[PDB]
């Protein structure tokens, strides 16, 4: 039934909400090594369970992928005899050759009144939009030969077409393009690719071209797609009405070029319009797609089950960036959680937090100086001494909080008493600040809600002699960090420091009693991916802290900027 969707022909009572938002797949017990490997990959995943009454999906142990000897009536009989058919309400089916010798229906020919199909070649007419999933067609050449991981760059050829048994029209148009341009378009004829008076190896010839052509010879889905992705050349699918595999989640627009079948003589002109940078990007995306989804049957099975699980639990679906980022750009990505360009008004203010151990004579000065500024809402003071008590009745709203333990990281806890967004963390030692400076700092924070706005300026440099980072403060020519003393920042940064801090950085800063500002700067510069705004054995410890923070992150999130904000 082509009209079936996930809201009508699917059953959601069977599997509902669970703490671990993963669907549970049950496999029936009964041939191709392909299907055997698919089932083994499913079994050794997080989705395999027993107690059929508890699982949601069902994957029959019947050979479906190859339609040449499918015995469609026998497959229908097996599906009926599955003893758990239930009109195929939740069953998942896998296929990669949806074609028949009389006619290519571009879909499985079994009845499958409501069964879910994960096919290789789907047309835009035989593909259920939110129900079915388009899976890649597997070529054994992907694992048979391990091509070198050649980097992106210039190549000898520009356009290539290595296919066998094409229709005469396509080949004639390709030969016309080759005689028209020459030395860039190479049409190969019949694991060996044979040109005129020259021989190439099929897996390795694709490495010499920056574009590889995939055409519709039969079934609308060709195994050459996986080889093209593996070799790194950008696939040019000229198979109109073809839905690219995993197009639901993957962005095929950044990895392949699709040209309609009518404009085949225009292929060269279309491909000349693409700049080289997008060529490199598409090559990297193709390599990543092969190594993550096309490489093995296990990747295909995992991606299919994960797409289905995202469909059944939309609130848990993984991110788009996780779907289509190579690990290089995934590590280089930012994904700022505070990305809305909204400017909060002056109605709210900042909940100032003052961290003190001793020096309760500058702290009174600090409170007096901070309280004079406008827009201040709450002056929280955190008391870390287990021994000394704060002066009671000797101290606009003010709250004094006592810490269970004396840890330096108690100035960054998310307190429910904070009803604003800006948080001004200020220490007692800083006294040369006026009200107008704090007010202008808050005004600057209004336009930059997702980054530090701190008055002190400290940077870092690279030392050639020791091959380690160093902490530099004596001279000011550029700024990479602003100390948490008198630093405006979002309360979400406090939440991140308290909970989402990788490694043992919180434990380390608690133990060493120092280097909280550097850790805060590191975390903020990593999460937001933006620099900081400055408003106009001590050193060894700071340098060791910087080196440790760089080691735990694997790189240096800090960025050098030479600009400061001052009143107009």
């Amino acid at each position: 039934d082509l009209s079936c969707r996930m809201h009508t022909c699917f059953d959601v009572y069977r599997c509902g909400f669970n703490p671990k938002n993963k669907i549970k797949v049950y496999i029936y017990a009964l041939i191709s090594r392909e299907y055997n490997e698919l089932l083994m990959a499913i079994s050794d995943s997080d989705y395999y369970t027993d107690d059929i009454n508890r699982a949601c999906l069902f994957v029959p142990s019947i050979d479906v992928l190859n339609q040449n000897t499918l015995r469609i009536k026998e497959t229908a009989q097996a599906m009926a005899q599955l003893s758990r058919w239930d009109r195929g309400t939740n069953h998942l089916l896998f296929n990669m050759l949806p074609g028949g010798p009389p006619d290519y229906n571009t879909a499985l020919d079994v009845p499958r009144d409501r069964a879910l199909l994960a096919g290789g070649g789907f047309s835009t007419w035989t593909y259920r939009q939110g129900y079915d999933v388009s899976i890649p067609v597997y070529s054994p050449l992907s694992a048979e030969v391990d091509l070198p991981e050649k980097g992106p760059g210039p190549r000898q050829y520009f356009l290539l077409s290595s296919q066998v048994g094409l229709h005469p029209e396509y080949r004639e148009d390709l030969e016309a393009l080759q005689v028209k341009h020459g030395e860039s378009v190479l049409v190969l004829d019949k694991r060996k690719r044979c040109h005129k008076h020259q021989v190439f190896d099929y897996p390795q010839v694709l490495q010499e071209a920056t574009f590889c052509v995939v055409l519709r010879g039969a079934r609308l889905g060709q195994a050459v797609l996986s080889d093209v992705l593996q070799a790194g050349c950008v696939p040019v699918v000229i198979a109109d009405s073809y839905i690219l595999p995993f197009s639901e989640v993957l962005d095929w627009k950044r990895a392949s070029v699709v040209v309609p079948e009518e404009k085949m003589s225009d292929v060269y002109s279309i491909l000349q319009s693409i700049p080289q940078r997008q060529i490199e990007e598409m090559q990297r995306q193709a390599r990543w797609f092969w190594e993550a989804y096309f490489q093995s049957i296990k990747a295909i099975a995992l991606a299919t089950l994960q797409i289905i699980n995202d469909r059944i639990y939309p609130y848990a679906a993984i991110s788009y960036e996780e779907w289509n980022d190579p690990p290089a750009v995934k590590w280089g990505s930012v994904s700022n959680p505070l990305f809305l360009p909204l400017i909060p008004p002056q109605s709210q203010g900042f909940t100032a937090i003052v961290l003190t151990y001793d020096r309760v004579e500058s702290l009174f000065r600090v409170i007096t100086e901070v309280s004079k500024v406008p827009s201040l809402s709450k002056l929280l003071v955190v008391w870390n001494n287990q021994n000394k008590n704060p002066p009671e009745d000797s101290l606009v709203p003010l709250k004094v909080v006592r810490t269970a333990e004396n840890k330096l990281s108690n100035r960054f806890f998310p307190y429910d008493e904070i009803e604003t967004e800006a948080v001004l963390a200020i220490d007692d030692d800083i006294i040369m600040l006026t009200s107008d400076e704090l007010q202008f700092g808050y005004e600057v924070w209004r336009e930059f809600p997702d980054r530090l706005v701190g008055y002190p300026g400290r940077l870092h440099l690279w030392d050639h002699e020791m091959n380690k980072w160093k902490y530099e403060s004596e001279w000011t020519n550029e700024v990479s960090m602003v100390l948490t003393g008198a630093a405006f920042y979002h309360k979400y940064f406090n939440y991140l420091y308290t909970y989402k801090m990788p490694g043992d950085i919180k434990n380390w800063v608690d133990a060493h009693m120092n280097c909280e500002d550097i850790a805060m700067n590191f975390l903020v510069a990593n999460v937001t991916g933006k620099a900081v705004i400055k408003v106009t054995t001590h050193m060894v410890e700071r340098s060791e802290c910087i080196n440790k923070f760089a080691s735990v992150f694997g790189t240096m999130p800090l960025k050098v900027v030479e600009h400061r904000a001052d009143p107009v």
């Binding site: 909400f17 007419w125 939009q129 700049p275 997008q278 309360k491 904000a565 107009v568």
Partner: protein
């Protein structure tokens, strides 16, 4: 065969008419004798004010009717009779081949189906409430259901002024809407008292539908009505985290757009509803989609959602509203751009442009399909801003600059992404230019320049102003000493309609003002300042604001300076 209900672009569409790189839409003239609704007037004005509008029928490859098709219920007062004859009698109908039909309501009382009435044929319909089982995957466009008072231009700027953590409020799931005693589609609303709770899941219902509801009422309605009048609906949506948007008579409802304005994450209950612009917008980032069959355990599922997920959903809801749903002009332009992104499937927008700032309506893929050619997607990729800039000088003197300057272009009357626009009467040192470019590298989306001017709202004349001396703040930086992205040149030349630029040319100025308007509209962020002839500026600003519908300029009192 494939020319019936199962129409797609490669079967029921004439690519040869669009094969010319000139995608234009043609509006039928009015018959001057048929009643027309205000919403359809807004749709037609949005199409006609767009750059896609052309008067010559031959050049256009997209057609939109002049007859009101938005209201297709015979019980409604905007229904147009004998529309089948009036659509078959058209000379350019051509079986509705390249015709785009807008629709908002359909169906009769006994069963609200997709009764558009007249034979659509091969035309594509931008219907509001589309069931997924009756939606063409790459042919139809699902549009939001907007009111007759929905703004034509501009917008309400959303509601979420503060991004608060934890991203929670006084209640969690809220719904104040009518429950229908008889009819179709009231099951989910009637079954809400099962999950109604205290001040965590407050679900209000009203049985006062029509005039004969008294006969069909039950014992439950008596208590509901008194408690219904306790909370205000607009207030309730603002004290709520998740806004329930169930199915009423039809799949779509006005409550979806109200959930997005209120910044509450909508929890749709309508089964099989093709969400507005689903084919280009990822709806798992701005909303929570939950089946109405598992209605009882919905609140537990909502509680299971992590706080970071809630923060991301709320912000994405805000962005999506302010990008693609704020005004009917935005909806029409979104539908037209979705249409345009299917003719040439190599010059179209990827899924990252639609679902990230600034949105697809300001990102034109005809400039380039490479995300690195735009100033918005450097952080998302692993790229850095370009290190070289092209200096463009418009001459109607010194020009001493070598560092960071790949080339100098002098215009008498571009390879790098960054563009330095300079006026020959302005003298700038090379160190200043280098500092400006270094500042721009941190903020590639904005405009970084030395001159700055601001605006004001004069209540006496109800008119926008322009000041240029000793301002305490600023919202515009002149292009005469500014650094920006060449895509802004492309956007100015190919996005704004010819009228604004024509007035700019005829007034001999006001191009920098319009440039600042455009950049502030696309970025929604103020520019950065680094360190008789006066009368027409106000008219320029008023005309530009009238075209936009609001004032995109945002004040700023910061000033980046070297250390």
């Amino acid at each position: 065969i494939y020319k019936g209900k199962k129409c797609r672009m490669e079967s029921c569409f004439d690519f040869t008419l669009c094969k010319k790189n000139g995608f234009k839409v043609y509006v039928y003239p009015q018959q001057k004798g048929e009643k027309i609704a205000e919403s359809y007037q807004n749709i037609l004005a949005a199409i006609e004010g767009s750059r896609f509008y052309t008067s010559d029928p031959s050049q256009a490859c997209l057609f939109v009717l002049s007859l009101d098709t938005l209201d297709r219920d015979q019980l409604s007062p905007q229904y147009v009779h004998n529309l089948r004859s009036k659509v078959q009698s058209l000379h350019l109908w051509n079986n509705g081949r390249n015709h785009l039909i807008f629709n908002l309501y359909s169906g009769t009382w006994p069963d609200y189906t997709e009764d558009v009435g007249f034979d659509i044929g091969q035309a594509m319909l931008a219907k509001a409430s589309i069931s997924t089982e009756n939606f063409r995957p790459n042919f139809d466009v699902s549009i939001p259901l907007f009111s007759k008072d929905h703004p034509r231009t501009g917008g309400e700027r959303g509601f979420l002024k503060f991004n608060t953590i934890p991203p929670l409020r006084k209640y969690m799931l809220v719904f104040k809407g009518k429950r229908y005693l008889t009819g179709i589609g009231s099951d989910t609303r009637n079954a809400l008292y099962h999950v109604h709770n205290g001040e965590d899941v407050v679900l209000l219902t009203t049985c006062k539908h029509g005039k004969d509801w008294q006969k069909h009422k039950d014992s439950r309605c008596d208590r509901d009505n008194t408690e219904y009048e306790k909370y205000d609906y607009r207030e309730m949506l603002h004290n709520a985290t998740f806004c329930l948007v169930p199915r009423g008579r039809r799949l779509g409802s006005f409550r979806f757009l109200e959930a997005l304005q209120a910044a509450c994450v909508p929890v749709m209950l309508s089964n099989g509803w093709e969400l507005p612009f689903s084919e280009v917008i990822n709806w798992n980032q701005a909303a929570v989609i939950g089946d109405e069959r598992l209605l009882l355990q919905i609140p537990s599922t909502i509680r299971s959602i992590h706080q970071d997920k809630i923060l991301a959903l709320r912000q994405q809801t805000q962005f999506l509203w302010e990008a693609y749903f704020s005004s009917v002009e935005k909806i029409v332009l979104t539908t037209l751009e979705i249409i345009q992104d299917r003719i040439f499937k190599h010059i179209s927008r990827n899924s990252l442009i639609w679902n990230k700032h600034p949105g697809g309506l300001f990102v034109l893929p005809q400039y380039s399909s490479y995300l690195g050619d735009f100033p918005y997607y450097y952080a998302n990729l692993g790229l850095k801003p370009p290190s070289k800039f092209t200096a463009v000088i418009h001459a109607v003197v010194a020009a001493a600059k070598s560092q960071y300057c790949a080339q100098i272009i002098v215009l008498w009357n571009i390879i790098t992404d960054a563009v330095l626009s300079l006026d020959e009467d302005t003298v700038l040192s090379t160190t200043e230019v280098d500092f400006a470019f270094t500042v721009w590298q941190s903020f590639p989306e904005r405009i970084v320049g030395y001159p700055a001017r601001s605006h004001f709202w004069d209540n006496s004349k109800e008119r926008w102003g322009y000041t240029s001396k000793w301002t305490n703040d600023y919202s515009m930086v002149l292009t005469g000493a500014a650094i920006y992205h060449k895509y802004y040149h492309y956007l100015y030349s190919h996005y704004l309609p010819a009228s604004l630029k024509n007035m700019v040319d005829q007034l001999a100025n006001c191009e920098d003002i319009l440039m600042n308007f455009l950049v502030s509209a696309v970025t929604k962020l103020p520019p950065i300042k680094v360190t008789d002839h006066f009368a027409q500026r106000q008219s320029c600003m008023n005309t530009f604001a009238s075209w936009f519908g609001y004032m995109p300029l945002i004040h700023s009192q910061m000033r980046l300076d070297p250390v």
